[PDB]
Design a protein around this nucleic acid. Structure first.
Ligand SMILES: [Ca+2]
Ligand SMILES: [Zn+2]
Lengths: 320, 80, 80, 343
DNA sequence: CAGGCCAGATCCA
DNA sequence: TGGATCTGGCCTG
């Protein structure tokens, strides 16, 4: 861009394109850490400052010689500030949407925003030379999109914005990029714990943002649908990828799943998996390993990311 | 016939709005699932007796409930 | 540069006094050479040798970091 | 002073810093694996057998009434004496701290197979906060056996915790806790002779005294070359605690203790500073009322150890220390393991 | 092509 | 001869 700007300068004589410093000055408005937002009630364990930008994803993890070794690089965004920036980037879009359905313009009803968070690791990412830890050649990304935004009007609800291309590359807004391994669990938990803590804190909070001259409140509903099956199992307790218990949505075993194949129901959740892990760890009924596994239905871990029990269309098509 | 059954199934979970894009295929998804399962049991007994794969089970069992709970399946994919 | 890499890998094991070596010994020599190369000059290990690797390895600090793993001094001066 | 290379089979990707070795009548077992337990060994404990310098990790089954415990990543090691084994606190693989305590025992045994027994115990009184890196030893004063706990590292309280500094750690309170194993009671004793916390220190037990030496204080980012001797008696009424500062202590954190001979302990390895390596070894000739730390001959270390940043290990029990070196990038098998003979 | 789990074929004290 | 022990098949990446 600098080359193009310079040659256009030299030939035309005017200033058709703006300089790089002007571009960088205009850059800061869209990036998080520029708008003021107030919480009520204030988020638990989340600072009230409104100018946090790009922070280390390790969240100040101890990296001395005396504790667990760290071999990851992670730069991440605070979830609330990132949501504020994502909402402000579509200020005109929300105004247009509210205008389309013949609603008001200064209406400040509590918005209900649904967000699809997707996390998927990668392979064959080339590690670079240079100062840093012994970073593995795997990269894990965390990202979120704003699917739909609704306002409460009268007795029912009405949609304001709906994304026309939910699977496009223009809506998968990045949140946290760590160059770590998906199979490794300790580092994954250490890096992704703050984001889950912020999400849990915001599950029951109200965001206030000055939306085009009128203050409006916000609400957040989160669905973790964008995980592949292997990561879903590796996160929400289930072991490996191929075992006696197959589905991540039902407690049905492989043999009777093959036998019936037509009649099933959805049972698994996150609180249920937490209860099952507690049962596994405490062993209340004084059982052997096999009978305890049968009772717990394959939950042999502590889940730490709430994944909505959905089906991934792309990998389903690949497998079929 | 197995091939045709798969092509009749795919729009249901690939549509970004199945209620407004493929209602005719949506209304017979249960019958298609039954027919596919019985075909696999009978004509393809040599592979699907006592052993079936995760994605086939998911497609034949859980799709309508997910559609009812969410509204769309393909919208919330990881392809983005 | 690849030939010099192999020469360093051999010299950090003192083959001139041990004419016979085992595959485990050669593997350990490779591993320790890679670890200390990373620690000192900060080059990651690669399987097909590039030209940037050649330019960075063709330095005096290279023989320094190698000779701080060679117990003898005659090898130090010869490599230098 | 014999150092021998040991080879590991198809489970080498499962040994991580913070593991502990458990000795049961000459049999050595393992704890502290990577990730949540798999179907190869759902229990989490392992059979640590070394024959001809080769290591095989066969699964070990728990009892019917046992409670299946998560792999603690930095627990506290104790040796009760009916020979049981007690671990306190540590990190789960999901990186949250636990204040629970476990009791290990061998319920039944047949030819080359064992069944362990895990017991859940809840402490009452001044419950120690969940922490890792601390040390717990037992004392025998006037025929009464009782356990003593000291501070370590723990996460910041649930009020001054912030998500940006979510993984920040600070040393525990200088308080010394007392745990009565048979009743699970805890009484906090604050003693003025202790002013700063300690982490990754070694603890030496005797009839009625514990000798803690070394330790790392993160608040001041220093490692004291000091030595605290604590003496505890058990009268009919409340226990009385007294600690004395003694000279000759060393400045070592995350060292490893071994019991070679009666009244004879050896210290091998550790870190003097952040980039410094505790290359020389110290012998601790324990005595009735005298403590003398002397230096033995330095074992012939390998170049891999002499030029690595990290090593970690535990006590094999039979005068052997099992220390490891980070092998290489995952891209031999990510870890090189060594065995060390202590007389 | 790594990685993990399960049903099956040897096998050895 | 009844569990150990490889060993290939199968599942997801
Ligand atoms: Ca992928
Ligand atoms: Zn299912």
């Amino acid at each position: 861009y600098h080359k193009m700007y310079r040659t256009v300068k030299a030939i035309t004589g005017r200033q058709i394109f703006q300089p790089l410093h002007a571009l960088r000055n205009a850059e800061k408005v869209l990036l998080p850490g520029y708008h003021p937002f107030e919480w009520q009630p204030p988020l638990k364990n989340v600072s009230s400052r409104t100018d946090v930008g790009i922070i280390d994803g390790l969240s100040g993890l101890a990296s001395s010689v005396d504790e667990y070794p760290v071999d990851t690089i992670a730069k991440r965004f605070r979830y609330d500030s990132a949501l504020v920036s994502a909402l402000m980037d579509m200020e005109e879009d929300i105004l247009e949407g509210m205008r389309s359905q013949d609603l008001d313009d200064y209406l400040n009803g509590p918005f209900t925003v649904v967000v699809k968070e997707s996390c998927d690791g990668m392979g064959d990412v080339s590690e670079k030379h240079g100062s840093g830890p012994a970073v593995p050649e795997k990269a894990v990304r965390f990202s979120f999109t704003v699917m739909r935004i609704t306002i409460e009007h009268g007795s029912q609800n009405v949609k304001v914005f709906e994304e026309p291309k939910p699977n496009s590359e223009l809506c998968c807004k990045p949140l946290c990029l760590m160059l770590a391994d998906e199979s490794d669990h300790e580092t994954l938990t250490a890096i992704l714990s703050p984001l889950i803590a912020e999400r849990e804190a915001m599950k029951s909070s109200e965001l206030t943002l000055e939306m085009g001259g009128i203050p409006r409140t916000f609400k957040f509903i989160f669905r973790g649908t964008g995980y592949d099956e292997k990561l879903v199992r590796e996160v929400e307790g289930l072991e490996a990828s191929g075992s006696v218990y197959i589905c991540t949505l039902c407690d049905t075993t492989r043999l009777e799943a093959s036998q019936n194949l037509v009649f099933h129901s959805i049972t698994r959740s996150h609180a249920e998996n937490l209860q099952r892990y507690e049962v596994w760890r405490s062993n209340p009924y004084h059982e052997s390993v096999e009978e305890l596994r049968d009772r717990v239905k394959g939950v042999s871990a502590k889940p730490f990311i709430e994944t909505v029990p959905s089906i991934d269309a792309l990998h389903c098509d690949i497998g079929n | 016939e197995l091939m045709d059954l798969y092509l009749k199934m795919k729009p249901v979970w690939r549509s970004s709005c199945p209620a407004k894009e493929c209602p005719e295929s949506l209304c017979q998804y249960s019958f298609n699932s039954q027919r596919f399962a019985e075909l696999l049991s009978t004509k393809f007994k040599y592979r699907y007796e006592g052993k079936i794969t995760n994605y086939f089970h998911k497609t034949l069992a859980h799709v309508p409930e997910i559609i009812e709970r969410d509204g769309s399946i393909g919208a919330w994919a990881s392809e983005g | 540069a690849a030939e010099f890499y192999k020469i360093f890998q051999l010299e950090i094991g003192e083959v001139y006094k041990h004419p016979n070596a085992s595959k485990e010994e050669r593997k350990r020599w490779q591993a320790t050479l890679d670890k200390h190369l990373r620690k000192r000059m900060n080059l990651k290990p690669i399987m097909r040798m590039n030209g940037n690797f050649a330019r960075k390895l063709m330095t005096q600090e290279t023989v320094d970091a190698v000779c701080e793993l060679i117990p003898s001094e005659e090898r130090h001066e010869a490599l230098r | 002073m014999s150092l021998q290379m040991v080879t590991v089979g198809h489970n080498i990707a499962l040994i991580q810093p913070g593991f502990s070795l458990m000795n049961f009548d000459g049999q050595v077992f393992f704890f502290g694996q990577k990730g949540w337990p798999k179907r190869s060994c759902p229990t989490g404990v392992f059979h640590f057998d070394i024959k001809q310098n080769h290591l095989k990790l066969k699964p070990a089954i728990f009892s019917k009434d046992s409670c299946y415990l998560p792999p603690l990543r930095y627990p506290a090691t104790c040796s009760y004496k009916k020979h049981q084994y007690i671990i306190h606190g540590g990190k789960t693989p999901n990186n949250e701290l636990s204040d629970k305590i476990y009791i290990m025992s061998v319920a039944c045994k047949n030819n080359k197979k064992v069944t362990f027994r895990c017991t859940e115990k809840d402490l009452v009184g001044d419950v120690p906060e969940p922490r890792y890196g601390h040390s717990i030893d037992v004392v025998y004063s006037r025929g009464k056996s009782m356990g003593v706990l000291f501070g370590g590292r723990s996460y910041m309280p649930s009020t001054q915790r912030t998500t940006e500094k979510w993984n920040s750690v600070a040393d525990c309170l200088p308080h010394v806790f007392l745990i009565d194993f048979e009743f699970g009671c805890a009484t906090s004793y604050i003693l003025p002779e202790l002013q700063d916390g300690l982490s990754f220190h070694v603890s030496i037990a005797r009839n009625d005294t514990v000798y803690i030496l070394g330790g790392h204080s993160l608040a001041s980012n220093i490692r004291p070359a000091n030595l605290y001797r604590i003496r505890v008696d058990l009268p009919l009424g409340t226990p009385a605690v007294n600690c004395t500062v003694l000279p000759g202590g060393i400045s070592v954190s995350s060292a490893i203790l071994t019991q070679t001979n009666n009244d004879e302990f050896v210290i091998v390895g550790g870190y003097q500073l952040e980039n410094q390596k505790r290359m020389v070894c110290s012998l601790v000739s324990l005595g009735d009322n005298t403590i003398e730390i002397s230096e033995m001959e330095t074992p012939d270390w390998t170049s891999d150890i002499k030029h690595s940043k990290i090593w970690f290990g535990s006590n094999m029990g039979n005068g052997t220390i099992f220390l490891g070196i980070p092998g290489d990038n995952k891209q031999s098998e990510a870890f090189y393991f060594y065995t060390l003979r202590c007389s």
